[PDB]
Amino acid sequence: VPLDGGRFATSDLNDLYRRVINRNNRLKRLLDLAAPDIIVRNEKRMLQEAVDALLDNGRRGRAITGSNKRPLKSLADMIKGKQGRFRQNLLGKRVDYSGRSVITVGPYLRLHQCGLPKKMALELFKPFIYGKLELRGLATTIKAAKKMVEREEAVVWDILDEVIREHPVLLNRAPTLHRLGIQAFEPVLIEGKAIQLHPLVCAAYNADFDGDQMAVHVPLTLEAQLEARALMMSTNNILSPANGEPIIVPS
Amino acid sequence: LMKAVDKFEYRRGYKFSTYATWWIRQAITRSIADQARTIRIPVHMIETINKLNRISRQMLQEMGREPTPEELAERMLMPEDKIRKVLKIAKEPISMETPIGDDEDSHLGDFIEDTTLELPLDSATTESLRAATHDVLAGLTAREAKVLRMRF
Amino acid sequence: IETPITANFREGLNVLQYFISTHGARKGLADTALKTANSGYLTRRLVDVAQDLVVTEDDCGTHEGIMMTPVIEGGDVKEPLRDRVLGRVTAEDVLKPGTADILVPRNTLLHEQWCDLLEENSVDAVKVRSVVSCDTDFGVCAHCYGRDLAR
Amino acid sequence: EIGRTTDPVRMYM
Amino acid sequence: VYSYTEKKRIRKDFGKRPQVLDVPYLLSIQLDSFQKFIEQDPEGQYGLEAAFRSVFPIQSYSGNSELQYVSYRLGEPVFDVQECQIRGVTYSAPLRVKLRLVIYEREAPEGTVKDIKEQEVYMGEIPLMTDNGTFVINGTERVIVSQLHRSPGVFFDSDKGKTHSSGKVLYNARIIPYRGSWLDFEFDPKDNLFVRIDRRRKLPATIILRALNYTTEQILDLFFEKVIFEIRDNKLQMELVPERLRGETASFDIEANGKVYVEKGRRITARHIRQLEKDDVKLIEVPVEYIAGKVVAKDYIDESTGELICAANMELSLDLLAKLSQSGHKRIETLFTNDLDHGPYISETLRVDPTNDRLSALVEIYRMMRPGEPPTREAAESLFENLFFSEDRYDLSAVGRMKFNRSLLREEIEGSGILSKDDIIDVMKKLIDIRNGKGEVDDIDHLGNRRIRSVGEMAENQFRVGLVRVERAVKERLSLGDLDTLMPQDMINAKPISAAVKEFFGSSQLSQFMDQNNPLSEITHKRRISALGPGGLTRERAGFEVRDVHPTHYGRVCPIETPEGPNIGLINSLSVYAQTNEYGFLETPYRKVTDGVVTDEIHYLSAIEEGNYVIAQANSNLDEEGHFVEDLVTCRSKGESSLFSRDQVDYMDVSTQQVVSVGASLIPFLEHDDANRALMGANMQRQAVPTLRADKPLVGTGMERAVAVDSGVTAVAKRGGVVQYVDASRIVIKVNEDEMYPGEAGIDIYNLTKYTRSNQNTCINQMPCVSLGEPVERGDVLADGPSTDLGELALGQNMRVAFMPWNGYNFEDSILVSERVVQEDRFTTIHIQELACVSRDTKLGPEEITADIPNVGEAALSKLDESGIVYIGAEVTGGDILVGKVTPKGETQLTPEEKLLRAIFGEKASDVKDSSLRVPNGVSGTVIDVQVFTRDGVEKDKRALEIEEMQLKQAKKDLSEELQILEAGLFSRIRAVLVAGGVEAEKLDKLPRDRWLELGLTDEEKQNQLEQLAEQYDELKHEFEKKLEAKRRKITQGDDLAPGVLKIVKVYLAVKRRIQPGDKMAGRHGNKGVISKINPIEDMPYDENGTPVDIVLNPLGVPSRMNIGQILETHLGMAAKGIGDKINAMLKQQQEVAKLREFIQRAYDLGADVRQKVDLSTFSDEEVMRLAENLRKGMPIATPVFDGAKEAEIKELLKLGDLPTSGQIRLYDGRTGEQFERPVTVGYMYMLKLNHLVDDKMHARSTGSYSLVTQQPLGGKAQFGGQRFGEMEVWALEAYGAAYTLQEMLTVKSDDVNGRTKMYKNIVDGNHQMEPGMPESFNVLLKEIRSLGINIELEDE
Ligand SMILES: [Mg+2]
Ligand SMILES: [Zn+2]
């Protein structure tokens, strides 16, 4: 693809394939020209080395350097490693409908509810707001609904309050040591840019209030919402899986 | 060297090295100009680029600092746009797997997005427009709807 | 070091004692930095070995079990028998301490009431089923596992 | 001395 | 005794130990390094001169051709620092080198030069260090961090039984040169010596010795002693050196002169040794069975047949001795070897060694170095010569040679740069002695074995690399060159030097962006020591022995200032008094102490010399005589501390602050805080962002003035005088008569730096702190930079804090803030960001900056002028258009029913596409600067013309004002010098100004009366005209942009951010917290006077963290605020000035044997009133780190005030009105606002862009991307029963291309259902696996 600025970006497989093709063409030319045995053997060895480096660089001999300084990346290199396809792009993947910010206390909350900024919820539940606006007849077209949401009229807030009334969310801390690292809560619209977290779940989350952050995930389908309500709800797991003792005790 | 051997003549009295050097260097330079870049560039344009680089280096050494592309037209014989195009020719492409500091162990390829995809908002607008035009065409008479559907 | 620190935090520590304490502070920080990195690898290795185990049956119909006794090291007991028996299913029927009458039946779940009864009766050692003796193929049965210690 | 090397440059030389 | 700038506000000092050494300059390291890098040194010493002399003269392949060096010069920079910053270029200077080419005669080795060619060549550019020790690479400021690495030399390791199961120690040696190959010697469990080269396969140690032209007999002579055995009657009569019978076990009988000194089974003791020495016994009787294990020294050959009777280094037995004695030999010598003191490892190594001679050793070395290649004699000899005996490939520079000589216990400190046979033999003998037991191994963590490499040294190395790369090419060119057809300019290319310097300065691990958000952060970065980078260590490759503080760190490296995380203990910071030795080692000042008197002479001692003597402690009592009060003083001799006599003390510590760095020296009551908390507070002290207004820290340490003055953020008066003009952006100083040159117009003009953005998008502003007519002196502060007030450092604000729980709003670490704090704008910061619009050229046509944007309403462009650029000073919010831009669009596509829609509506498709620049969402501000750059050959627009006109007008105005200021000063000097001598009385003044100077009426004695002025006027006018012409030319000239771009427009936005919940706040004692709520004023607790509190903190964090420094500072701040309130009330009552004088004198005299002495009897009434007005908001108090105030002094100060001595008062609930039990500690303490702003962390996404290779979301907050669902989260969801949630997480929201759009359409339609589909990542993996020779497929059944 052409990079912004009139430049280009390429992968090392293109260069490996280029090398292989060029050496094969040279070998064909030398065979056609009845080259001496020593030259033919040298070309065959070069072709073997090129194919070996294409398949797995750095395995048989020294790795072939890339453009300037670094060695080339091969198919085996892409397959393997922590940054390989299996671990980085197939076992775990970035997802949509997610958000993160700083957490606060908010001691007035109940065990089954948390605090959520208005802007974060407005940004997250955009399709739901669009559908509700279309259904209520306030917006004729989805484009009109999007324009109303961008303008932030007095009715989009009511629509958001209606839709977030009984739709749980998922809160997760970046170290997930045990099962209780992800829990479900019932959002409450608040003013500000910080999430409020119940003090009782602080010990379970192993979180503090000195600049820690947490992630937010919105269940999409009906089955996911019901699973989050029936299994991942904070009130549904008060006992530690490791030992049969309470985990929401005051500190 | 094989090509030079195929055409060597010993009756001139000159040694074989003098005749072979020209052929060997010509073959090496032709191979370099042909298959040393990701994007192929013709031999004449490669020679033009090399000549421009040599001049620029000579003028930088003689005068004191980097000159301007406009001033190169006075030294050379160019319409002042060919030099600009040669300069605007893209260099060798950047590796996709190059790193940027630590960046949580991420490379350059993690920040390139596909521009060929269509937005779901656009797809929904298209579906809504299709439904609305179908509804509007149902209201018209059958012959009018048929002739419209045939025209468009 | 044969010379201890005789000043507390309320009083003023001197440069020598502060420099001495810096060694321990840096050792603690390095140990804390390395413990997480080791524990992550250990947890990953432990998760990846037992990810395919799923309860699939309800009762495999086995008679084996593990003999459970309190932990004695040569002094005061560090593990009462109530902790190691609560929530488990008994592999064989329990008898009276005096070997006179039949105690709690074989296939019962020992809750807090059963544990209190066993404590009152002063039973020496009750044997219980375990997952290592389960006869279920490709999984384990609920009875051998016992009860989930979260509900 | 037939082996103990990996680089083809040495064998060519 | 006090300066004018100090009389304004005097800080009370509670220290007791007198100061004898002033704090040195904190930025001396970089300045000194650059000044050693570039300077005209008339010697062959360090620098470019060095480099040049290291390569040139470059001679030809014996063609009587050499290019010889002569001199080097540096040119004037094209642009200054400000212009370089604005244009985004490098602030460097051209390098001019004067060379000379000489060609000798033909067929004459020493013939006269045929021709001489002298010319001057240009060789690259060299960046120049600014006045603050920084560099400018591309529009930005960068700081190079000093590197700490292992010093070159020889070191010995121990390896206490780690690689062997039996626990035997295996000693070894290693030689590390400055540039070359490594040489290693090591032992084995079989007591054999081995040698390694470049960590390759080990070879026997005798191979290199044989290759050094050494035979077996010479090796045995060198490495062993000789004992001679005779053949008299008995033939068993060897000489007996007395010291050869020590430490061994006796096995036979020794007899001399018919005396049995030792019987069977008896051990020779010291009595036997002294008896033999007294008897002078030399010849003894020995049994014939004793010679069974002996090894012959040399080889003996027969005289008849010339046969080798016995070879060297072989066991001698009865048959062998008989054979060599029947051939006519009378003198036999063997090797004296023991089992515990003289180990025969050389003989065993020789026996193992399979090589025969020098040739065999060379063949073996060549085979080891280059396996698979057929050895050649010449090739092996060249390789051996080049390995360690070639000056081009091996370097042993002065520091390495000195270390080698010191370790070898030599007498000279200078020598050759290559190794030698004597050196190798000495290292081998030292290793043998260490193995035997005499001697001790070295530790690599000793500060005496670690060297500091600086930016000058690194730049010199890079330049030398470039110079050798260039000399290779010049030799290649001169190999086939000529004599009278080339100039000394064609063979020199500045490209490799330029590339080397550019890559070194731009892309390097030690070249980092400067952290310019705090003067403390700026001064800390330049004093940073790193053990990483090229030639150092690696963060994951290091162990524990380098990550822990060593006893040698005392006084050189701060033990508590290092980052926590992956790199801890490798980014250490320099201490206050630490310096750098000539060879690059660290040293610290010390006070020389004679037999009884502690003198005031300062001596600098390195780490090696420190252990030799014994150093006393800083806090030692002495009464005005230098004698210690106590007969015993606690001192440290060698890495340990113990009691010592008074007369045995050799040195004393200079000060109590020499053990910590500048960052750690600014924490009051540091000794009362835990080490981890002190380190965290030091790490967090440099992250504070400057606030809108900063007054002063109520409790300090006294280093604030030094930190503010040493940094370049403030303005210091070069010369004393009287202020002539004051402005918000200019200060004019009239220089004193005795402080200025004989002839010149003496006037100093300082230009202040207005609002500008820093590397962290903060605000930099300078404000005057002087009035009109106020006298000034040298070193006085004239302008205050960011986070600085009255020439003192002020990172944050001081607040009234209370320690009590408040309805769980401060549960873990949260901080409760009252509404008045945000009402008074005490923590409001200004942020400035720069946005750029780029107009490039496309194949479809060039872009335009027009203002007719299609499908945009008129109300959406009202802030744009006719040229399409937003106005200066316009208020803009998120989504507002700043610069309008369009791009060509030709025949993209037409989907069905759109033709019908256009037919119905008669609409035309836009020819152009909207690509204008708009304000990012969620941010507002004001436009304060607009800059336009245009390429040559492109016509400028109205905004460009207006900007050019404004710039020309401003430049002309500034030049004219400065010129007329100079002329006004010159004419004032004219009048003064005239009146001083040879003037008319009241007639020369009436002369017109043009001719007033045109008098010379009496230069009779006053030669310069007008003489020194007209020349000054002439040069001033000429330079003004020339600078005007040059400046207008530079302004009117075009710019140099990258190919493909036409115009660039830069817009600057000023953003004012207030405090809100979610922001992070911290103190100076390692305590931090996030704001939770903002209560009204009426809700805050109040005292009996109705004064509410500002901050409410949780007491639950004090006992666990173990930091009483915050409590002590709170008490001290409360006492200081009480004193300030008393002063303010007395000023408000304005009774008299004697009462104020008496109160201030009492306050300044309160203490207990304090070194500071302040007397108000020499102060005038105006100065007393000024000081009283400056002390209204509280009297500042200085608390030295290890010499601060005590609890008794704090209580005495509180008693001086009207506040209770306990420090706790009674509070009432502002909600309920009822008092609180358990009185609450209330006081004032310093607070800081770290730049962990919540609005820079909040992010959310529903739909966006996806990556190219894998259709997955992008990163975070940069491309509007989503969070990452990791393996731990997957495991948590598998532990739960949320199978459907996991499926919708890893298929629909991430990878399924049809899944995501189908789900979006279903959600819009109101149906909450999904289709699972198939992830694209698995298809990509399948294709990648199929690209190999592996067949993988999915079958359907
Ligand atoms: Mg925390
Ligand atoms: Zn079972």
Author numbering:
A (entry chain J): 253 to 503
B (entry chain L): 412 to 563
C (entry chain J): 755 to 905
D (entry chain L): 90 to 102
E (entry chain I): 2 to 1342
Excerpt from the publication:
Here, we identify CedA as an unconventional transcription factor specifically associated with the RNA polymerase (RNAP) σ70 holoenzyme. Structural and biochemical analysis of CedA bound to RNAP reveal that it bridges distant domains of β and σ70 subunits to stabilize an open-promoter complex. Finally, we show that CedA modulates transcription of hundreds of bacterial genes, which explains its pleotropic effect on cell physiology and pathogenesis.
To gain further insight into the mechanism of CedA, we used cryo-EM to solve the structure of CedA bound to the RNAPσ70-open-promoter complex. A structure of the whole complex was determined at the overall resolution of 2.76 Å, which let us to build the CedA model de novo. Instead, it binds βi4 via predominantly hydrophobic contacts. An N-terminal part of CedA, which was reported as unstructured, stretches along the DNA-facing side of β-lobe and the very N terminus (residues 5–10), bridging the gap between the β-lobe and σ70 region 1.2, effectively locking the melted DNA in the RNAP main channel. The N terminus of CedA forms several hydrogen bonds with σ70. The only side-chain-specific contact was found between CedA Asn9 and σ70 Arg385, whereas other contacts involve main-chain atoms. A close spatial proximity of the CedA N terminus to σ70 regions 1.1 and 2, which are bound to a nontemplate DNA strand, explains why an apparent DNA binding site of CedA was identified as a −10 σ70 promoter consensus sequence.
